[PDB]
Structures are given as C-alpha cells and as structure tokens.
Design a protein around this ligand. Structure first.
Ligand SMILES: [Mg+2]
Ligand SMILES: [Mg+2]
Ligand SMILES: [Mg+2]
Ligand SMILES: [Mg+2]
Ligand SMILES: [Mg+2]
Ligand SMILES: [Mg+2]
Ligand SMILES: [Mg+2]
Ligand SMILES: [Mg+2]
Ligand SMILES: [Mg+2]
Ligand SMILES: [Mg+2]
Ligand SMILES: [Mg+2]
Ligand SMILES: [Mg+2]
Ligand SMILES: [Mg+2]
Ligand SMILES: [Mg+2]
Length: 71
RNA sequence: GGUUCUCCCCGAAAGCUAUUUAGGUAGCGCCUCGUGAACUCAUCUCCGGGGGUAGAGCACUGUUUCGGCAAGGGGGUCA
C-alpha cells in the first residue's frame, strides 16, 4: 500500500557524513589524521608515486609489442 | 588555522626501508572490518641445539711491574 513498502535488510547503508560532532566517531578531521599532504584538501599523490624513489613501473623494463593480427 | 547530532564494539604509531629526503610521501611492521583451513600460536615441563657476551684468564695480539741466569751493548786501559 505504497507507504507499507520497505527495502531489504542491509540494502541501504546510510553513508559516512564527516565533521559532525564527537559522538559521530568520525568528526574533526574526517577520518584523515592530523596534518600532512594526505589531510589537505586536494591532497594525496598521483598513481604510482613511492615518494621520489623510482616507481615500480619505471625501474622495470618494458617488453614485447602489440600485434595487429591478434586483435 | 578551522571542520557542527548521539550511543555501542575494537583500537594503534612515532620503527625499518627508500626518497633534491629529513616537519612530506611510499612498501613493510603495528590498528581495524570481512572471508576459509590444519593441535596453527601462546604459557610452562622433559629432550635436541648452535653461540663466545657477563665473568674469568694470559699460550697467541699488544701492553705492563718485579726478581735470577745472561749473549749483545755503554764507559775505560794498553804496546
Ligand atoms: Mg560508522
Ligand atoms: Mg565511525
Ligand atoms: Mg575516534
Ligand atoms: Mg588541525
Ligand atoms: Mg605531525
Ligand atoms: Mg598524515
Ligand atoms: Mg632522486
Ligand atoms: Mg623518527
Ligand atoms: Mg620507537
Ligand atoms: Mg620522515
Ligand atoms: Mg617539509
Ligand atoms: Mg658487551
Ligand atoms: Mg671482561
Ligand atoms: Mg679480570
């Protein structure tokens, strides 16, 4: 009867909402520590960056060639 | 610098490694949630082990104080 309809158990998961008091658990720093590049807005680092060490996908040598006949 | 409602469960780290790196970041180490298997792990008993630290010692590496024998050396004496 329209108002009687409810979803399955565990279907909806609420979702994390950050910065909303202490009781919320997460709140004041939205689960992202104190300071550093990761805490800052637009933070983090690009994909495959090991902090100036030459990343795995450059220290290893490239190999082979893509065949046109294989496609 | 600041990041706003509430209860319940578990709960770190400030280490290694690398870095124009050192107040940053990454992988591992430590937290957590989830998913499966073996007596898997922990505590203590009685066995098997390797070590070369504490201590001790002076054959060796050097160092060191005495006493006994003593080549070899330092002072003297000749035609
Ligand atoms: Mg939550
Ligand atoms: Mg929470
Ligand atoms: Mg918390
Ligand atoms: Mg702050
Ligand atoms: Mg800090
Ligand atoms: Mg941080
Ligand atoms: Mg460099
Ligand atoms: Mg440190
Ligand atoms: Mg420490
Ligand atoms: Mg550092
Ligand atoms: Mg810095
Ligand atoms: Mg010692
Ligand atoms: Mg000793
Ligand atoms: Mg002694």
């Amino acid at each position: 009867r329209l108002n009687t309809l409810s979803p399955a158990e565990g279907s909806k998961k609420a979702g994390k909402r950050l910065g909303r008091g202490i009781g919320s658990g997460l709140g004041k720093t939205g689960g992202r520590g104190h300071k550093g590049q990761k805490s800052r807005s637009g933070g983090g680092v690009r994909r495959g960056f090991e902090g100036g060490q030459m990343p795995l996908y450059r220290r290893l040598p490239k190999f082979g060639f893509t065949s046109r006949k294989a496609a």
